Amino acid sequence: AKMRISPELKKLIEKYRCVKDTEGMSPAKVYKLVGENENLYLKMTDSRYKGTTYDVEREKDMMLWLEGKLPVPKVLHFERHDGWSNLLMSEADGVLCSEEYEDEQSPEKIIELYAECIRLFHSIDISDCPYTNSLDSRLAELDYLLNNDLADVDCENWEEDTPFKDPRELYDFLKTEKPEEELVFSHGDLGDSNIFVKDGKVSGFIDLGRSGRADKWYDIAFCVRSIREDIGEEQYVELFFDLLGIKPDWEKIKYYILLDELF
Amino acid sequence: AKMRISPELKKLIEKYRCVKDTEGMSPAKVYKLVGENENLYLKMTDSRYKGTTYDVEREKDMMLWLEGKLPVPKVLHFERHDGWSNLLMSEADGVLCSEEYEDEQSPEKIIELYAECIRLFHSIDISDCPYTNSLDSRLAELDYLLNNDLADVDCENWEEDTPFKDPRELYDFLKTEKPEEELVFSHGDLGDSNIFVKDGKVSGFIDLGRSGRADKWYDIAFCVRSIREDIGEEQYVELFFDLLGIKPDWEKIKYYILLDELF
Numbered sequence: 001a002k003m004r005i006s007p008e009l010k011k012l013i014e015k016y017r018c019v020k021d022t023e024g025m026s027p028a029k030v031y032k033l034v035g036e037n038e039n040l041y042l043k044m045t046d047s048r049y050k051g052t053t054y055d056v057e058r059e060k061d062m063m064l065w066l067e068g069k070l071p072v073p074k075v076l077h078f079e080r081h082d083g084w085s086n087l088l089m090s091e092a093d094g095v096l097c098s099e100e101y102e103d104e105q106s107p108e109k110i111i112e113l114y115a116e117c118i119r120l121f122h123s124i125d126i127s128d129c130p131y132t133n134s135l136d137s138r139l140a141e142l143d144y145l146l147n148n149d150l151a152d153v154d155c156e157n158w159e160e161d162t163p164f165k166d167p168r169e170l171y172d173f174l175k176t177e178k179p180e181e182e183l184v185f186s187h188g189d190l191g192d193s194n195i196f197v198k199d200g201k202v203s204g205f206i207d208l209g210r211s212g213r214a215d216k217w218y219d220i221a222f223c224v225r226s227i228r229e230d231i232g233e234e235q236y237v238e239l240f241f242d243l244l245g246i247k248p249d250w251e252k253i254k255y256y257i258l259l260d261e262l263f
Numbered sequence: 264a265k266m267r268i269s270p271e272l273k274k275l276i277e278k279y280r281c282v283k284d285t286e287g288m289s290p291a292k293v294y295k296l297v298g299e300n301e302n303l304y305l306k307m308t309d310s311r312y313k314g315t316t317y318d319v320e321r322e323k324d325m326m327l328w329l330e331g332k333l334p335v336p337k338v339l340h341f342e343r344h345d346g347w348s349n350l351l352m353s354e355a356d357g358v359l360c361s362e363e364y365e366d367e368q369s370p371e372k373i374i375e376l377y378a379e380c381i382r383l384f385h386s387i388d389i390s391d392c393p394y395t396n397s398l399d400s401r402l403a404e405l406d407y408l409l410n411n412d413l414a415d416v417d418c419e420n421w422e423e424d425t426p427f428k429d430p431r432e433l434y435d436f437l438k439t440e441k442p443e444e445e446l447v448f449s450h451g452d453l454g455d456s457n458i459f460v461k462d463g464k465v466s467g468f469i470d471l472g473r474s475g476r477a478d479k480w481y482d483i484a485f486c487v488r489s490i491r492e493d494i495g496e497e498q499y500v501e502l503f504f505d506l507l508g509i510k511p512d513w514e515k516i517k518y519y520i521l522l523d524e525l526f
């Protein structure tokens with residue numbers, strides 16, 4: 001009788017061939033359900049992450065609210081079952097960006113894509129957005145994650161050259177250097193593994209747990225980080241800002257990139 | 264202050280560049296520590312798995328006990344820190360079995376390797392083996408894992424054509440159909456990901472959490488499973504037994520393969 005999914009959800013997915021996603025970049029369990037005529041995806045998060053930006057329930061609320069606003073998968077079924085938040089969704093439309101630009105010398109293409117994403121985001125009306133992921137909320141969550149050992153451990157943070165010696169040290173800095181915020185729609189984890197492209201245009205967004213209201217520099221900083229991680233040429237960072245048509249605010253960019261090292 | 268590893272351990276791995284292992288087949292956190300002189304491996308399991316066959320402390324004990332008996336990595340450092348069990352070990356010698364066979368069709372070489380491991384395991388004197396992984400012990404921990412929702416993430420267990428409707432039904436079956444046991448040294452998870460080869464002969468064994476005393480058919484069953492899903496041809500299973508010089512006991516083989524489903 002003890003199961004992580006309900007009998008109702010089990011019936012909906014029995015006909016599919018379960019292939020667990022190998023990435024495992026988050027505490028969530030992700031499953032591709034290979035069917036005869038389509039694939040579905042089931043994302044699950046345990047009770048320890050209930051209410052946090054990692055909670056897939058969060059992720060369903062944003063998916064529903066984002067329908068008609070951004071290209072997102074369809075919510076086929078959601079439920080809370082024995083502490084688990086279970087989200088059954090349709091397969092995103094298009095090609096995963098990390099795949100589309102995998103072995104391809106064209107950093108400029110993903111830059112153009114990021115620019116496009118930031119553009120689309122700034123057009124989204126957040127007046128009735130389900131979640132506000134301002135720094136007060138994010139830091140309170142981070143505090144909880146740290147205290148309960150639920151924050152992700154970037155094993156690279158153990159290397160001797162890392163600035164902050166421990167998670168709290170970084171947290172105290174984030175708490176102290178909290179920049180001013182101007183809320184706009186924020187994806188929360190604008191990476192090439194969460195974005196889909198079809199015919200040059202963005203075709204889908206997933207991993208929406210941190211989606212909601214947040215400063216504009218949050219997603220922008222994420223992009224700066226991605227640009228630098230893939231290529232050691234800072235010229236592409238300037239290209240990105242040329243495309244956005246704005247001046248980089250390095251203090252805010254550094255801040256949000258730092259905030260991410262605990263997520 | 265609060266960290267998953269102690270300052271002593273942190274100090275020991277500072278000089279190393281961390282590269283987290285992407286497999287993530289178990290609840291253990293595995294990290295490759297790349298250095299200029301050599302590479303080390305850091306394996307970690309949290310508080311919830313304490314005392315179970317997943318606990319790296321148990322794995323460390325077996326790693327220590329197997330020195331001079333089987334080619335295993337050297338225990339460089341062990342500690343219990345803030346609920347975590349951490350093990351710093353040397354890199355195994357040789358080539359990963361799944362890598363040496365990567366694509367190159369050489370089934371009989373793998374069959375001979377598996378055969379070699381079984382014969383090698385049977386020559387091991389278990390008179391002072393630290394652990395006895397009898398079925399009572401294994402089922403007892405399985406009961407605990409299920410009671411705390413720590414048993415293997417149901418993915419295929421959700422599919423329609425699965426024999427057991429739920430984990431408990433499977434557990435109950437194992438409890439009732441528990442066969443007789445003849446304890447020999449058992450690796451606990453004999454597979455191409457936990458075995459290393461050099462010059463066609465086994466050069467290293469890792470993932471020792473479930474190692475100790477257990478029935479001989481346990482590891483043999485795992486090889487049968489590996490042969491079928493890695494090689495494909497059933498003739499190679501017959502060959503496996505030819506090399507072992509024994510006739511397969513399918514009733515026991517099915518049982519042990521079934522035992523690992525929930526782990």
Ligand SMILES: Nc1ncnc2c1ncn2[C@@H]1O[C@H](COP(=O)(O)OP(=O)(O)O)[C@@H](O)[C@H]1O
Binds near residue numbers: 025026073
């Ligand atoms: N609805 C979906 N459509 C297509 N691919 C998906 C879908 N959901 C998940 N995936 C795939 O699985 C990976 C992990 O999903 P994601 O929601 O990003 O989980 P996490 O928060 O761990 O990153 C994604 O990078 C993508 O490859």
Ligand SMILES: Nc1ncnc2c1ncn2[C@@H]1O[C@H](COP(=O)(O)OP(=O)(O)O)[C@@H](O)[C@H]1O
Binds near residue numbers: 457
């Ligand atoms: N000491 C080691 N030397 C070399 N590779 C190792 C070592 N420890 C772990 N690995 C690598 O990391 C993978 C996961 O480690 P393992 O101990 O098997 O963890 P788990 O129990 O999750 O399978 C192994 O398949 C192997 O590729």
Ligand SMILES: [Mg+2]
Binds near residue numbers: 025193194206207
């Ligand atoms: Mg993601």
Ligand SMILES: [Mg+2]
Binds near residue numbers: 025189
């Ligand atoms: Mg995510």
Ligand SMILES: [Mg+2]
Binds near residue numbers: 288470
């Ligand atoms: Mg292993």
Ligand SMILES: [Mg+2]
Binds near residue numbers: 452
């Ligand atoms: Mg293991």
